[PDB]
Amino acid sequence: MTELFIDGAWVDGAGPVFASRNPGTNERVWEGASASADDVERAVASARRAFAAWSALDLDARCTIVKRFAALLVERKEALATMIGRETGKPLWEARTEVASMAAKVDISITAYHERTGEKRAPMADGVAVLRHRPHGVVAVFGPYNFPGHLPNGHIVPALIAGNTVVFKPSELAPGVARATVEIWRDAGLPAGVLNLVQGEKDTGVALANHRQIDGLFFTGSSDTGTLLHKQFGGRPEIVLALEMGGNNPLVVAEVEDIDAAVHHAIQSAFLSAGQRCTCARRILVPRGAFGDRFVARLADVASKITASVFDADPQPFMGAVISARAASRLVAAQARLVGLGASPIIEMKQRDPALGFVNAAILDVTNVRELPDEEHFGPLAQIVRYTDLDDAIARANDTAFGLSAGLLADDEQAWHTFRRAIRAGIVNWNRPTNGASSAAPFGGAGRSGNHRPSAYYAADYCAYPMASVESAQLQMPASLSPGLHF
Template sequence: MSATLISTEPATGAFLWEGPVSDVEAQVARARAAWPRWAAQPIAVRVETLRRFANAVRRDEEKLADLIARETGKPLWDARGEVEAVINKVEISIAAYSERTGQKRLDAAMGARQALRHKPHGLMAVLGPYNFPAHLPNGHIVPALLAGNAILFKPSEKTPAVGEMLVRLYHEAGVPQDIVRLIVGGPKEGKALTAHTDVNGILFTGSAATGIAINRQFASDPGKILALEMGGNNPIIVWDTVDIASAAALVVQSAFMSSGQRCTAASRLIVRDSMADMVIAEVKKIADRLIIDHPHADPTPYMGPLIDNQAADGLTESFLILMSNGGRPIKHMVRPVKDRPFVTPAMIDVTAMTERPDIELFGPLLQIIRVPDFAAAITEANNTRYGLSASLIGGSPDQYNQFWANIRAGIVNWNRPTNGASSKAPFGGVGISGNHRPSAYYAADYCAYPVVSSEIEQPRASIGVGMRDIDVSAMGD
């Protein structure tokens, strides 16, 4: 009897979904056998198929949003925003494919022409996260399908129901069933998938530890494409602004949206010491008003639960560790619902800590650091191995230019939150946030590889140097 995977609603603990764990070997074989037919389709066929997928998602928009909200715990308004991103990804990917991987022809010597085309890699494994279980894997799958790849999609073991619905919508739109295969399972199935010799590429979104392990696994195999998005320890600097209320709202949006379960969430507020008390007080005032409840609650919540009790236990423990090592609590983290993974947003001043942990605290836990000058603010912001997102709130144009030039991050914003990046731009980071293969608009770059050809209709060649003269006397009549 095969093993099964069960998914429950984090907000209520109610049973949501159950399905058999996949046979990775069999799924790889099916997709590998089907891939050549999909790759041979004209690009127009793949484009129209994916446009039908966007229409299928639009038709079932509320069903998908409801399922995302129930399986992740995020508020329904947040889940609806995720579904909208899934729909919009199709047209964005079509434009990116044309711009970044379209065919080009150039003149060459002797009447020949240079042709630039792109080929799909083959069989791509997409490993999705639980925080955006539809949008983030879809951000890999759509451009990979457009390029002519086949897909093995393993959703997080914490959100398999959303993964199953997403795959069903691809199939209903006309993507052949063997071209997108669902892999249900946990770490064991993920490792089997990434290690399989017939898998040509790994497109991963998740923790730095797992991404680094995958990168190490393929260190001696440069033939496999590897795109890693591994989160962040993101700074938001507040500097010399008279609009404290707006600055605080941007901090709250950066740190606590989606219960802080965004890879671009701000984990560190760096603030000028002369204005720190005003900023901290305003941020706390807003955070105290945030409604935390189940996804469909009335009044509408700003935050839902974390994904599970293990995540909530780990985050509350992290808060206690920071406090016991010199952190000064501003707003305590509380578990308001017994046995459920709800946590209140927390704030802690860690300025006095001699060593601050450089880890991704995936939840609504904001560390505050006071600094005396702008150079110290940038130094503190760069005090991390990560480098995904960073924002400056306030400051002058010259200071923003200094911030932009010196900050190590793939997303650098001014008077905007650290999260909410546009799919029309590249999305990725430096350090251990990624491996220099940004996704979103630039996903086209790693879903196909360039092939350059020099072409002419008739052979034409001669060798004009380095040849002996012909010995005419040795030639017969």
């Protein structure tokens, strides 16, 4: 079928055909022609044409549309959740929560727009000071596979509210989800050209990123890809880049009474979404000694009972297959590399079937690795690091160029204050999973995890620029003139 959405219509792409496969069954989910360079040109040209009339609308007219989109997401939740499940492996129970996050994004983004990029007037001596915020123009949005609905929506909704038009390039691993999402935008009444969908693989991505008529590029993906993008835009400060990248996130465990609650939060942190959330814990730092040993044993016990199954299994699994058979193979390979370097498995990762994305929830003790690779997380291979005192835990925690999330499990509030003041990261929790977050707070990694353009609540900030005016309805001479002015 027609798979590109350009200028208000589904059109056929000119580029090579590709497919997505359900990592749990290997059944094809989506298959279609990609967007060639010319298709991308048409998509951008369409966004550019539509921008004048979209940005010229009243704010409330744009808001009415995004709110309609939210209401349709709720109505069509099960179907969209099912597509996310089928295509990416994410369990149906979790997929539903992603859709709920997509809908909830709208009202939060309207509130953020008014808070961060609103409109204000104040008297001043020679007029009225007026602050407005204006959209940049055409923005490219690059989507990921881990939250193929929620994370692109976190760029798209604030971008649209502000009055930008959009060219959306979804991950090649979640084109079906993107199609289903664009369908709902269309039914919500979004005008022709305001959102354009270019499905594709690396060539489609490269063509969009290299286009000279885009005003911004909002990216969610790996630090390696994000960094290359950043390099590619060096010397073009006029393009706004928002790069939301990955991490090497630490979870520090210290003395707690409720050891099972700590284990629970560590399990959520390491293995929710099969370890594929940007904020998942890659390193779990646990003290040497008797308490630390009890924690590891209890963590291994519960983790060994983690069920990994097809997305619509009954009973529902905690996690699904990772995004692909290829990713599962890379994780196993990553474990073998670390074992090469002296790591010792607690729960060894195995890929159940080379054709599928199933790998078990795994725990690798990396304490004896001399120079621990500082590498981005992409699956449920938890690294245990044994430490001495809290100061040692903190130094280890911070031993990374990344800085997305971090957490502390501890009853001692004083350990929290020490930890939180020393740790360098954008999302930092106490006695919660590292993947816990307020939907109404900013979300931005430090170091290589970002480019100081936090998203979520602060997405507004990169979706519009301030335009400050002094307005004087009456033109008037000043009563007294600067020296040297003779009228």
